[PDB]
Ligand binder design. Structure first.
Ligand SMILES: Nc1ncnc2c1ncn2[C@@H]1O[C@H](COP(=O)(O)OC(=O)Cc2ccccc2)[C@@H](O)[C@H]1O
Ligand SMILES: Nc1ncnc2c1ncn2[C@@H]1O[C@H](COP(=O)(O)OC(=O)Cc2ccccc2)[C@@H](O)[C@H]1O
Ligand SMILES: [K+]
Ligand SMILES: [K+]
Ligand SMILES: [Mg+2]
Ligand SMILES: [Mg+2]
Lengths: 433, 432
């Protein structure tokens, strides 16, 4: 429409694809090196120059980037263009109170829309389909990324965003979307609300669900597909690389997300040593962007554990199950949360010692985050019961506001959280299984 | 950058503008009549036909449309193209539990981006400026309309959306926007938060504030301009017509929103008789779209009371103060709320009689919505205090969810709300 068709590159030969990748990879390395002081330093210190890349395998010579490099160059230090050529910024959780920040040229936004349209098409969406977009609109990459891709595909986009459960179901009923884009966790909430409204979940217009932003199981898939009468497809990404639409599953094979590696070049490494592993081996997923202008990323470590699998329905490889992470990051209802994020907010309250413990659990199918924090000892003496309840509320509101997750808060006497014999607490107890 | 400069039509002659309007009006009326059964019907019933329009003055022959017509044709009954050619819907409060729903073709989106870019440019914005967009992103037209306009103009858009007050100020501090787009009420919240963070409001990077979605005073303008060190400009619109970017003020003259009447054709009428009034005269603003494909609107009554003023900085006319409305609609923090909307949610709870009263008040500079409802008599006798407090919280949450506004809720005994001698209550007491 024109976007009903596959792009030529989607069905290109392995040779054609690898030639394109090599030509873009040379450009992207040199773009990074010339235009981003950090990469100039980081390459120089590693003894490597862009010229050193003669073949795809030569990528292993180049250093890794991580979340720390963004943190150390906040807010815009990793831009490879002047800010006056940057039309979009997006923001998500960092390890400190400064968000992780990414920027995009006009071309970058166009590229993003194109791969996100490609993803929705791979999953079976078409021009003219009504599409219910329940990913968060705003600083998160999910909502706006899915928005542009769907609009580029010629879908009728319902910009629902991520809350208002009764209204979600009202509009699914009234607007009759064929496609829903939503976290897998919130999809379950929506099914529950259909039931409470007297709507059998299989009596909906939906034929396709495209789920991402967090891991989900085969069992969740079977449960959604069966109850709602849809094909459910897996859409992957992360803000640093672009957003959603880094990889997406094809409905013809349903055999895991296809990585759009004409744009986003994947490697798998041992998470401990950093050595590159052969395709089929489980390790940590690393990306190098091939077409990004504003913020090229070079061997960016996702911390996601997975594996690369051979091409099937496309010219490109696939991801295996994403089985966890190699850092301490939590995802709650699609929202990235670091324990250190919470710590910073906890310590900011002068009545609290800084001692804290997050317990994650499952209440039915819903994740629950519960936060215990300790008073300073001098404070137990003087803080009233009403004062410590308000302290709990205030802490809950700041975490909701600054991190973006809802949490139960409990305020304990000093020593109230079980510690090592010298006072060290386990920061995260995840019982969600 | 292809959006730094004015468009030719912006400084065209009045003759040339009116000739474009007439041609586009002929097209719009016929597009509506040919393709929307509703309009076929209302035109026919009014004894008029698109051919009947031979000059701009002939528009007064055509019937008005209103929110009711959207209500009666929900969700998509006023589309003039197949739904498969519509790429966007947006939704805002109706008088019922069904939202007011509007649709756009790909071309429509492009047209809307163009007039919103033009608006932000009029207010002094330029390609390369960092713009902090704090209008709500989602079903509201505000967030996404401003988004596409600012992107089109080549601003660095920060897609902040409407909440998270501490984070708003953190990112204004850190990202150093030159432009903020936000409701005028929420701008005041933001200034308070600056103070609480130990930031003097005048030590921001901001140079331009573009405020709308609701009426604001000269006094609010003076306060914001003084305290923040900016020029504040007024941007107007409504979802049925397109969104924000129907009209916007020029920083050159700061004499009220310029109507982009190459796209949106204004009339002022007496809100009682429907008679068209001469420019300079106070009445009700009525729009007819000139370029819209998916949902052409013909003589749509905004219910906004204002006047048309002569051109100054552009070829196009300006709006006077928007002084109020000719219906019972409320706006709280940019969110449209109908009393009938609230009634529908109240009546849905089977313990409650349906008797209700909204009190609006000003808590400092902040609007409060406070809602009293009555139990049915048989229920007072039997509902505990815990249950009745839970009822209040549930009503509060359903109003927040379905209407989009926060409110205090009180649950009273039957007759607890002052009524007429035969039990009619005043629905709205606006003390703001
Ligand atoms: N399909 C998925 N399966 C498993 N994990 C996922 C999946 N999608 C994203 N994640 C996790 O979340 C991260 C990035 O979170 P971030 O907030 O940066 O970006 C958005 O989650 C972008 C997104 C939005 C909508 C759909 C898909 C992707 C990644 O490193 C994974 O750990
Ligand atoms: N600048 C303003 N001055 C006074 N009232 C305004 C102004 N802007 C809009 N209103 C009121 O809000 C309605 C429409 O509400 P609705 O939600 O459909 O559309 C968005 O308020 C669109 C908007 C978004 C952001 C900025 C400006 C305009 C309109 O009929 C007026 O009563
Ligand atoms: K995520
Ligand atoms: K409004
Ligand atoms: Mg179904
Ligand atoms: Mg200033």
């Amino acid at each position: 429409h024109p976007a009903a068709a596959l792009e030529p590159i989607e069905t290109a030969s392995r040779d054609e694809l690898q030639a394109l990748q090599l030509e873009r990879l040379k450009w992207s390395l040199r773009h990074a090196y010339d235009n981003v002081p950090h990469y100039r330093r980081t390459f120089d210190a590693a003894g490597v120059h862009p010229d050193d890349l003669k073949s795809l395998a030569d990528l292993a010579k180049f250093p890794f980037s991580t979340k720390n490099d963004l943190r150390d160059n906040y807010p815009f230090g990793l831009f490879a263009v002047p800010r006056e050529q940057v039309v979009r910024v997006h923001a998500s959780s960092g390890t400190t109170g400064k968000p992780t920040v990414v920027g995009y040229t006009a071309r970058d936004i166009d590229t993003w829309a194109n791969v996100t349209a490609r993803s929705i098409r791979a999953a079976g969406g078409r021009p003219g389909d009504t599409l219910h977009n329940a990913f968060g609109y705003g600083l998160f990459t999910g909502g706006l990324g899915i928005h542009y891709g769907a609009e580029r595909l010629g879908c009728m986009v319902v910009p629902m965003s991520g809350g208002q459960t009764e209204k979600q179901v009202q509009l699914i009923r009234d607007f009759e979307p064929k496609i829903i884009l939503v976290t897998p966790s919130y999809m379950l909430n929506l099914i529950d609300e259909m039931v409470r409204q007297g709507m059998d979940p299989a009596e909906s217009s939906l034929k396709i669900g495209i789920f991402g932003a967090e891991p989900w199981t085969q069992a969740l898939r079977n449960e959604v597909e069966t109850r709602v009468g849809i094909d459910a497809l897996d859409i992957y990404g992360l803000s640093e690389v672009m957003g959603p639409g880094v990889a997406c599953e094809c409905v013809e094979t349903k055999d895991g997300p296809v990585i759009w590696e004409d744009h986003f070049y994947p490697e798998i490494i041992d998470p401990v040593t950093g050595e590159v592993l052969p395709d089929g081996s489980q390790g940590e997923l690393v990306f190098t962007s091939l077409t990004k202008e504003a913020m090229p990323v070079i061997r960016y470590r996702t911390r996601d554990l997975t594996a690369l699998l051979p091409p099937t329905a496309r010219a490109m490889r696939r991801l295996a199950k994403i089985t966890g992470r190699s850092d301490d990051m939590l995802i709650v209802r699609g929202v990235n949360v670091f324990p250190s994020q919470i710590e910073e907010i906890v310590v900011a309250l002068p009545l609290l010692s800084g001692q804290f413990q997050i317990t994650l659990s499952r209440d039915g199918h819903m994740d629950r985050l519960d936060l215990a924090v300790e008073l300073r000892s001098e404070a137990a003496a003087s803080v009233t019961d009403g004062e410590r309840a308000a302290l709990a509320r205030e802490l809950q509101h700041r975490i909701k506001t600054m991190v973006g997750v809802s949490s139960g808060v409990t305020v304990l006497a000093a020593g109230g959280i079980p510690a090592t014999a010298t006072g060290k607490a386990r920061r995260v107890i995840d019982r969600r299984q």
